[PDB]
Structure formats: structure tokens, C-alpha cells
Amino acid sequence: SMEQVAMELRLTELTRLLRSVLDQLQDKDPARIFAQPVSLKEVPDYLDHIKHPMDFATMRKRLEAQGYKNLHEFEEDFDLIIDNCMKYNARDTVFYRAAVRLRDQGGVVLRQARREVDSIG
């Protein structure tokens, strides 16, 4: 139907906006601490600690399959990246501190993305 196509065009446009959001967020992680999934070879107990692992590469795979229906879903995955790190790692670590900086900096980007997603429908 024409209605399905129009909905598909909206999903595509959301996907374009989320790709730019994702790039902006990932630049707030210049150390690349959150680039890839935590390695189960190198942290074999990780899944005993963290039930829903997340990382920027996994988000990128989901994005390119147009797997985010709305900004809320995308933000959920971004929040898992931060929140998982802040539970697994102690306060005095380079990892925790990187998460805090990503959170604080990403907040700015997400504040305006929310306005763009509402604004452009």
C-alpha cells in the first residue's frame, strides 16, 4: 500500500537521523572503550554480571537493519552501554570514568535529537 511505503520512508528518515546521532555519540568516546562488545574470551564471567551487554558496533548493526522504531529504543541501547559499564567497573577506573564522560556529553546531543525527532515527525 501507499500507507506502508510512507511509513517506510519515515523509518528510513529516522534511520538517517539516528546514524548521525550515533556518530556524534561515538566521537565522545575517543578511547574506543565502547566500540565493540566486551570479549567473553577476555572476561569469561561477564554474563554472570551483565544480563544485556551492549556496545556501539552492536547498535550500528541494529541501526542498519532499520531496527530502531523510535528514539526511545535507541536511547535504551545507549543507556545500557553506560549503565553496564558503571556496574561492572569500579568508580576509580578508566572504564567507569569514560562512561561518565560519554553520559554527560551524549546528554547534550540527545537533548536536541529528541527535539528533531518530534519536530520533523
UniProtKB/Swiss-Prot annotation:
Portion of the full sequence shown: 555 to 674 of 1058
Tissue-specific expression: Highly expressed in testis.
UniProt-annotated location(s): Nucleus; Chromosome
Role: Scaffold subunit of various histone acetyltransferase (HAT) complexes, such as the MOZ/MORF and HBO1 complexes, that acts as a regulator of hematopoiesis. Plays a key role in HBO1 complex by directing KAT7/HBO1 specificity towards histone H3 'Lys-14' acetylation (H3K14ac), thereby promoting erythroid differentiation.
Domain Bromo: 9-113
Sequence position, cross-link Glycyl lysine isopeptide (Lys-Gly) (interchain with G-Cter in SUMO2): K41
Protein name: Bromodomain-containing protein 1
Underlying gene: BRD1
Assembly and binders: Component of some HBO1 complex composed of KAT7/HBO1, MEAF6, ING4 and BRD1/BRPF2. Component of the MOZ/MORF complex composed at least of ING5, KAT6A, KAT6B, MEAF6 and one of BRPF1, BRD1/BRPF2 and BRPF3. Interacts (via PHD-type zinc finger domain) with unmodified histone H3. Interacts (via PWWP domain) with dimethylated and trimethylated 'Lys-79' on histone H3.
